Amino acid sequence: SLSTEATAKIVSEFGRDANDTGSTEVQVALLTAQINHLQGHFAEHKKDHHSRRGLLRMVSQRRKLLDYLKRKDVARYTQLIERLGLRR
Amino acid sequence: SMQDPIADMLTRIRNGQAANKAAVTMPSSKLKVAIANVLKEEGFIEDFKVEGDTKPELELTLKYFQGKAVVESIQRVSRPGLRIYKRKDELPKVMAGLGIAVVSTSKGVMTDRAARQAGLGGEIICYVA
Amino acid sequence: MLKAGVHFGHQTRYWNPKMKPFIFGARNKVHIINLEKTVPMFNEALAELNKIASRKGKILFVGTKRAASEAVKDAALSCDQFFVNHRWLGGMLTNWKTVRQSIKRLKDLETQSQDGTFDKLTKKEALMRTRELEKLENSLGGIKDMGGLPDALFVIDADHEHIAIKEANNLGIPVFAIVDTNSDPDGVDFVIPGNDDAIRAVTLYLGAVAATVREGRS
RNA sequence: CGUAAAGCGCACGCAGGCGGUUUGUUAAGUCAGAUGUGAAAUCCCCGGGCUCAACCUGGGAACUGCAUCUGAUACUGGCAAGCUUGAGUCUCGUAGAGGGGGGUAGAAUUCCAGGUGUAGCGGUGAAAUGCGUAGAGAUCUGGAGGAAUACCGGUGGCGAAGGCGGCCCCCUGGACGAAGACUGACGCUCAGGUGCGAAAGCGUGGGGAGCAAACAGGAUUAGAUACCCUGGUAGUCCACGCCGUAAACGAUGUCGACUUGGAGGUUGUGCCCUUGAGGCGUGGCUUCCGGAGCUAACGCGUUAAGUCGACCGCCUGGGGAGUA
Ligand SMILES: [Mg+2]
Ligand SMILES: [Mg+2]
Ligand SMILES: [Mg+2]
Ligand SMILES: [Mg+2]
Ligand SMILES: [Mg+2]
Ligand SMILES: [Mg+2]
Ligand SMILES: [Mg+2]
Ligand SMILES: [Mg+2]
Ligand SMILES: [Mg+2]
Ligand SMILES: [Mg+2]
Ligand SMILES: [Mg+2]
Ligand SMILES: [Mg+2]
Ligand SMILES: [Mg+2]
Ligand SMILES: [Mg+2]
Ligand SMILES: [Mg+2]
Ligand SMILES: [Mg+2]
Ligand SMILES: [Mg+2]
Ligand SMILES: [Mg+2]
Numbered sequence A: 001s002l003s004t005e006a007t008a009k010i011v012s013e014f015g016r017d018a019n020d021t022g023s024t025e026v027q028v029a030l031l032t033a034q035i036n037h038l039q040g041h042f043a044e045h046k047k048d049h050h051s052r053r054g055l056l057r058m059v060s061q062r063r064k065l066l067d068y069l070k071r072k073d074v075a076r077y078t079q080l081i082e083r084l085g086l087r088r
Numbered sequence B: 001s002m003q004d005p006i007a008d009m010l011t012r013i014r015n016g017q018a019a020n021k022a023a024v025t026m027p028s029s030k031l032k033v034a035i036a037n038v039l040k041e042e043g044f045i046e047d048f049k050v051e052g053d054t055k056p057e058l059e060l061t062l063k064y065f066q067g068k069a070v071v072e073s074i075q076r077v078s079r080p081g082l083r084i085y086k087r088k089d090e091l092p093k094v095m096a097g098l099g100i101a102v103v104s105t106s107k108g109v110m111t112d113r114a115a116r117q118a119g120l121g122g123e124i125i126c127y128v129a
Numbered sequence C: 001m002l003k004a005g006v007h008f009g010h011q012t013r014y015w016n017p018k019m020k021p022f023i024f025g026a027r028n029k030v031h032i033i034n035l036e037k038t039v040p041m042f043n044e045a046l047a048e049l050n051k052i053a054s055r056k057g058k059i060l061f062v063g064t065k066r067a068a069s070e071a072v073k074d075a076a077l078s079c080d081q082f083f084v085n086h087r088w089l090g091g092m093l094t095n096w097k098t099v100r101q102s103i104k105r106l107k108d109l110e111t112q113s114q115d116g117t118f119d120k121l122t123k124k125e126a127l128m129r130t131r132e133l134e135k136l137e138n139s140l141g142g143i144k145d146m147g148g149l150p151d152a153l154f155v156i157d158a159d160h161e162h163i164a165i166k167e168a169n170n171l172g173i174p175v176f177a178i179v180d181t182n183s184d185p186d187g188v189d190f191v192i193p194g195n196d197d198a199i200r201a202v203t204l205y206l207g208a209v210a211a212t213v214r215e216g217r218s
Numbered sequence D: 001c002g003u004a005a006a007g008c009g010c011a012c013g014c015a016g017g018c019g020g021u022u023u024g025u026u027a028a029g030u031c032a033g034a035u036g037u038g039a040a041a042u043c044c045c046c047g048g049g050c051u052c053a054a055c056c057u058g059g060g061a062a063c064u065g066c067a068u069c070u071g072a073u074a075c076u077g078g079c080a081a082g083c084u085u086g087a088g089u090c091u092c093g094u095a096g097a098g099g100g101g102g103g104u105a106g107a108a109u110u111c112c113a114g115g116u117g118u119a120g121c122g123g124u125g126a127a128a129u130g131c132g133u134a135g136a137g138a139u140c141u142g143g144a145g146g147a148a149u150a151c152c153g154g155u156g157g158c159g160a161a162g163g164c165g166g167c168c169c170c171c172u173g174g175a176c177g178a179a180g181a182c183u184g185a186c187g188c189u190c191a192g193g194u195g196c197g198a199a200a201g202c203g204u205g206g207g208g209a210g211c212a213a214a215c216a217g218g219a220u221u222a223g224a225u226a227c228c229c230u231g232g233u234a235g236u237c238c239a240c241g242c243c244g245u246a247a248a249c250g251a252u253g254u255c256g257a258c259u260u261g262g263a264g265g266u267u268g269u270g271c272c273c274u275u276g277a278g279g280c281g282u283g284g285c286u287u288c289c290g291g292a293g294c295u296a297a298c299g300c301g302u303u304a305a306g307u308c309g310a311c312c313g314c315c316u317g318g319g320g321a322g323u324a
């Protein structure tokens, strides 16, 4: 789900300004925030495989976006991943 | 997912002859204008334009004669899944020489008949019967 | 130039996709055929009709759809050529050599009724003979005086009388005709756009034809 | 590779393959040139010698190759800086049996208790088993339960496929449209892998009306271990696991481009006078009919089985066998 205001905040933290929204870092941030907000919904139900599938979609989306970001510039990439809380 | 723009050009022309459309409008590229330049100079296409700015939508003007469209056939050869680079003498003649085969060489894109004079060959792009 | 009456196109939704050059959209949810392209078409077609008429070539004016048949018969008997206003028997051209004896039959029998055996067998027999006579007289009457093969097959329609076109197109016979929006200009050579179901349209075209052919004997 | 053998049930996705557009560079592929080599014979060509031939034999070409060397630089690759038409994010809405969790209502069947009441009820082609004067069937009342949700409902909708329909709340997925905004090729496919996957089935604990394998009886029949009838257990229902299969079928892989029309359905939005249940447009999904073309034919036909491109899967006579 993720509220519209939530996104309004997240953008103004991972981009240039409120006007921007399409940059990679912003997209990844969004994906991760939503995923984390979804962790709960799968704490129970568990049989919800369709919602699940939507999740998996946004997850692989995130891995692709991150992979690109890395190949483009490892520097700020290391910043992003170190901040967003992930990686093995 | 639009893996091969050239074959797409050729197939736009092919469906444009089958449907007998006048102009064929397609996104442009240097190789596009080169190949279209070859077909034009050879006489397969009556004129063309690269009209467009940041998104050059070059359009070709297909030729006809009697009732049948001029282009006999136009098969893409050196597809991206299988590049073909013929040697000088190895350059094939199409329809015993009355049909040019657009071939890209170091001197530029040209007909094979010309590449027989240029003393050199290169990637054969497309047979045009 | 719109010479006189109305004949813009007609039909409605089911326009034949082949006739894109000669269509427009009327507010009455029905197409209106362009006259601009039409004028040179029937002009040049009439020119060809005058050329082949000077060639003294036999012409067939094919027609049907009831009300048009009269216009057809009028445009041939008023002129000098030939006509098939009624049922167009399949294979009367590419299968012409049996139709040939069908005609021989018509002529010899219509002669037999006018002076010969008028009731010799039985009154019933006379009835049957008059009957069959009238049948062959209206079935293949307009082609009776031919005995050869038409130099040109002018048709009153295309999509409806498709068999006449496909048949006369099997051999060296030009087949220019007035076609409607839903018609196919495939087998047809010199296409003449304009509506067809109207009587004024067929009287107009066919009459112009009468003029141009009527000049061929001079 | 729709129906002849042959698209994995569906998806996600690593390696791999392939990749829009402009400029620079490099020159890996590619191409041109040169030199070295490519043993001799053999093969081929032109001569010579055995009386001819075979065979022998001189010269030549050939040895489709490989390597270094100097060039070319269009196309591809690498590196660099980019562009926006691919892909993606944001904003406003729209429709929906999409999913999961929790409630809840009505009709009905069955059971239970009692009232009224009386000999049949039930079933079938007919009939019997079956139920019934211990009072059934019919009927009325009260109750208890489980399961599925008439009407709406539609070649209607949604979902990747399987699949999903009473109503309600709660959590939640995706699709689409409008005007923009921004990212800058982040794409497509995908072996191995991972997930999902009707029904039946299996395990554990519940539930059990109806229905119903197995089973039993009655018939029918030459027989009837079936069809038909009367019963009836597992199963069907719930929770959690497993199974991993279907004619999992538009028998039709996915993504992209292009190529005449018609009638519809469903769902948005722009526009025009709503000037009257309308008029003219623009997207998404979907049904039927058909043109060019394709096809062995049937048929398909802008949601192609047409015209092409990328990648993957699979086929190679029937049987043995999808078995050991
Ligand atoms: Mg098969
Ligand atoms: Mg499939
Ligand atoms: Mg890759
Ligand atoms: Mg490129
Ligand atoms: Mg090199
Ligand atoms: Mg040797
Ligand atoms: Mg000798
Ligand atoms: Mg040599
Ligand atoms: Mg380069
Ligand atoms: Mg480059
Ligand atoms: Mg912008
Ligand atoms: Mg696999
Ligand atoms: Mg089951
Ligand atoms: Mg069980
Ligand atoms: Mg499993
Ligand atoms: Mg199977
Ligand atoms: Mg199959
Ligand atoms: Mg069809």
Ligand SMILES: [Mg+2]
Binding pocket: none
């Ligand atoms: Mg087995």
